[PDB]
Design a protein around this ligand. Structure first.
Ligand SMILES: O=c1ccn([C@H]2C[C@H](O)[C@@H](COP(=O)(O)OP(=O)(O)OP(=O)(O)O)O2)c(=O)[nH]1
Ligand SMILES: O=c1ccn([C@H]2C[C@H](O)[C@@H](COP(=O)(O)OP(=O)(O)OP(=O)(O)O)O2)c(=O)[nH]1
Ligand SMILES: O=c1ccn([C@H]2C[C@H](O)[C@@H](COP(=O)(O)OP(=O)(O)OP(=O)(O)O)O2)c(=O)[nH]1
Ligand SMILES: O=c1ccn([C@H]2C[C@H](O)[C@@H](COP(=O)(O)OP(=O)(O)OP(=O)(O)O)O2)c(=O)[nH]1
Ligand code: NA
Lengths: 185, 185
């Protein structure tokens, strides 16, 4: 009951989840360079990014706790970001089809006397998909807003065959863990 | 648990306190430059140093959980370091004397899937300290390697009227806060 909570994120999904906690908080973001260094692992980066996002806002609210977060879709070491065009979206899906990939979401929490950052990994298995299925879904323009060219919610759910890990993390924020780190505040 | 635990400290006090966890671990020799930037605050720099010690060892042993810590004796936003082996210890002992000062200790825990830094702050109040008392405390090398020119342990124990925080943090390691944090590693 001493410090205000801030969610450094404009992702509706991250908002939907954090409300679960039932904790009054504001939404405040400050753009930061999403530069990703090649000679660095995805886990390193996803963690570095979520760190940057939270700090840029925490530097503006020293006496606040700020939650940064970031998700990556990776398979075979490579990680697919958001599609630049409806066509790269189709390519990304063609790659995820009928197999598994990793979804890495890193969460960073900053305060002046305490800081915590960690990542959560989940394996996602896709049914084999078809052009019709791929383009129809692309129509919705959903894949266009996410990394990996797909959301696990909505029409995307039909591609996921199963996961091993945390559903909410694949959505952008692992609430169970996030809620548990906050308890140290 | 699947990661080995490592203490990146040369400190015999941090070792005795860590043993209280009855958890197997090993001790590694860290080499880092205690160069602290004057632009930053005490609470910041200390966290930063703990964070550097740990990161140095985690860098070599990426599969492990690394603990690093650092303690400071600050009086009025001014912090007293280690005497270059002169009247340094004596003079500052005349500063603390008959008043309170802050002992700030920061603990950093590194791992490739989770990192955590925080700091404990304890208020220390002394009785008025005399000349005969300080120097007699000096001979025994004791007040010349522990920042502040005193050790709450040993002879310095007599200089202390009371503390307000965690005695173990003053020794250099808030073991109770450290353990809790580890339940999440
Ligand atoms: O191409 C971009 C554009 C923005 N951002 C970052 C900057 C800022 O930290 C945040 C703003 O929200 P945005 O919707 O752009 O990104 P997100 O990753 O979808 O969600 P979040 O709000 O958590 O960043 O995203 C990037 O990393 N890359
Ligand atoms: O352009 C850069 C600079 C640094 N890094 C990474 C590697 C470097 O080792 C780390 C710096 O520390 P980080 O920001 O990961 O965490 P921190 O130690 O908690 O930050 P601070 O130095 O603000 O305490 O960030 C990058 O990816 N890109
Ligand atoms: O002027 C200096 C130079 C170095 N150091 C630090 C960083 C260096 O790595 C370490 C070497 O001695 P030691 O490790 O014994 O220091 P400590 O402060 O007792 O604890 P730790 O072992 O956790 O570093 O001390 C200082 O505190 N002051
Ligand atoms: O060389 C130094 C000396 C001290 N500090 C302290 C003060 C600072 O507030 C804190 C956190 O690091 P910083 O403020 O540099 O943030 P960053 O630029 O995000 O760090 P990084 O370069 O690791 O990404 O560590 C440094 O960072 N760098
Ligand atoms: Na924690």
């Amino acid at each position: 009951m001493t410090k205000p909570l801030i969610l450094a994120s404009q992702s509706p999904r991250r908002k939907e989840l954090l409300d679960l906690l039932q904790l009054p908080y504001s939404i405040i973001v400050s753009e930061v360079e999403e530069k990703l260094n090649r000679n660095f692992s995805p886990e390193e980066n996803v963690q570095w990014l979520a760190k940057q996002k939270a700090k840029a806002v925490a530097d503006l609210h020293p006496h606040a706790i700020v939650i940064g977060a970031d998700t990556m879709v990776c398979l075979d070491g490579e990680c697919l970001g958001k599609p630049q065009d409806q066509e790269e979206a189709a390519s990304m899906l063609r790659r995820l089809s009928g197999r598994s990939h990793s979804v890495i979401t890193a969460v960073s929490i900053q305060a002046e006397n305490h800081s915590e950052t960690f990542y959560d990994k989940t394996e996602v298995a896709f049914w084999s998909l078809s052009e019709e299925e791929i383009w129809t879904y692309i129509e919705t323009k959903e894949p266009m807003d996410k990394a990996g060219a797909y959301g696990i919610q909505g029409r995307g759910a039909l591609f996921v065959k199963k996961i091993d890990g945390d559903y909410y993390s694949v959505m952008g924020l692992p609430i169970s863990k996030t809620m548990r780190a906050l308890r140290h505040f």
